[PDB]
């Protein structure tokens, strides 16, 4: 190997990175409801559910290991009175119970006003794509992607596997393709409809830069 001109050094990285964890969740399983967009002035907001980092695993003791109507049915049944949700944070790797009161009396979509999606929380912090530079009149630009502030955290899909950002963009090369995008100013998710075009008249097929890794994770506060 000769003598390597490189050596190893210690650096600080987020707790939510780079290990093997199927987690310590009560009721077993490794999947829950990923909290995406949280509407303002909503029960969900008041309950303290933070977008991207929070997964709903249980509600009033009932484990949510299936993509079924249980969560809404339970919310419907306990409308306007408090419900207890067990929440897992990919940020703190800890479990916490938040009280929340579903309602029809607030002017917003849903009982909680929270966009969710059923998936696994193992290494969910690693499946993020940082949007770097963005060219003018690019597919990325027109779609609504913005430089450095936006993070692509997955996509709504056609049954295209695996969907890592790039293997979507040449398959959807004709027409969109919908993305879920996190923004560090709003600290919230939004849905972006982008139409890829390798001949759009510039860089790549989106006309933006992409970062992946420790240098390009969704930022985390110093303390829990």
């Amino acid at each position: 190997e000769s003598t390597s001109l490189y050596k190893k050094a210690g650096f600080l990285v987020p707790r939510g990175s780079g290990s093997s964890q199927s987690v310590e969740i009560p009721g077993g399983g490794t999947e829950g409801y990923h909290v995406l967009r949280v509407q303002e002035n909503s029960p969900g907001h008041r309950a303290g559910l933070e977008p991207f980092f929070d997964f709903i695993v249980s509600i009033n003791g009932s484990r949510l290991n299936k993509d079924n109507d249980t969560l809404k049915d339970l919310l419907k049944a306990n409308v306007e009175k408090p419900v207890k949700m067990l929440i897992y944070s990919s940020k703190t790797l800890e479990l916490r119970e938040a009280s929340v009161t579903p309602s029809n009396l607030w002017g917003g979509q849903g009982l909680l006003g929270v966009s969710i999606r059923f998936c696994s929380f193992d290494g969910a912090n690693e499946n993020v794509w940082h949007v770097l530079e963005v060219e003018s009149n690019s597919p990325a630009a027109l779609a609504g992607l913005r430089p450095h502030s936006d993070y692509i955290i997955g996509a709504d899909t056609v049954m295209n596997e695996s969907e890592d950002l790039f293997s979507l963009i040449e398959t959807h090369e004709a027409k969109p393709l919908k993305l879920y995008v996190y923004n560090t100013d709003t600290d919230n998710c939004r849905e972006v409809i982008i139409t890829p075009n390798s001949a759009w008249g510039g860089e790549g097929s989106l006309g933006c830069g992409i970062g992946y890794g420790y240098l390009h994770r969704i930022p985390t506060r110093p303390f829990e």
Binding site: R37, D67, K72, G110, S115, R117, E161
Partner: peptide, 8 residues
């Protein structure tokens, strides 16, 4: 197999 966002 793949779910898709919905509102609660």
């Amino acid at each position: 197999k793949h779910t898709k966002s919905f509102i609660i």
